[PDB]
Design a protein around this ligand. Structure first.
Ligand SMILES: *[C@@H]1O[C@H](CO)[C@@H](O)[C@H](O)[C@H]1NC(C)=O
Ligand SMILES: *[C@@H]1O[C@H](CO)[C@@H](O)[C@H](O)[C@H]1NC(C)=O
Lengths: 49, 52
C-alpha cells in the first residue's frame, strides 16, 4: 500500500540573453547617396538624402 | 538496547539525526511533504562573446 508523488514544470533558460533570434515587420524604406564631383579643377564630395 | 523474544528481520532501524544540509537531487526521497529551505549556492562560469 505504498504510493509515490511526482511533478514537473517548464521554465525559460538563462542562456536566452546571448543566444536568441528575433522577428520583425518591415515597412517602406528610405534612401541616401554619396557623390563625387569634379568642379573648377578640384575634387569635392557631397552627401544627401 | 536488547529486545527479548524477537527474531531478526522482524524489525527496522535507521539513523535520524543530522546536522548538515544536502542538495535535493531527484535521486533521493523528500524528507517531508512540504520541504523547508536552508540556503542556496551559485553556478560559476557564465557565457561571453569571443572570436574564432
Ligand atoms: C555579446 O553579448 C551580449 C550579452 O552579454 C549580447 O547582448 C550581444 O548580442 C553579444 N554580441 C555578439 C556579437 O555575440
Ligand atoms: C582629383 O583631382 C585630380 C586633378 O587635380 C584628378 O587627376 C584625380 O583623378 C581626382 N581624383 C579622383 C579620385 O578622380
Amino acid at each position: 500500500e505504498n504510493t509515490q508523488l511526482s511533478e514537473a514544470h517548464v521554465e525559460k533558460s538563462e542562456s536566452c540573453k546571448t543566444e536568441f533570434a528575433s522577428a520583425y515587420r518591415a515597412h517602406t524604406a528610405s534612401a541616401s547617396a554619396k557623390l563625387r564631383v569634379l568642379y573648377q579643377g578640384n575634387n569635392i564630395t557631397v552627401a544627401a538624402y | 538496547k536488547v529486545i527479548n523474544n524477537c527474531k531478526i528481520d522482524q524489525c527496522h532501524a535507521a539513523v535520524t539525526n543530522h546536522k548538515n544540509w544536502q542538495y535535493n537531487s531527484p535521486l533521493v526521497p523528500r524528507n517531508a511533504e512540504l520541504g523547508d529551505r536552508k540556503g542556496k549556492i551559485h553556478i560559476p562560469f557564465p557565457l561571453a562573446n569571443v572570436t574564432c
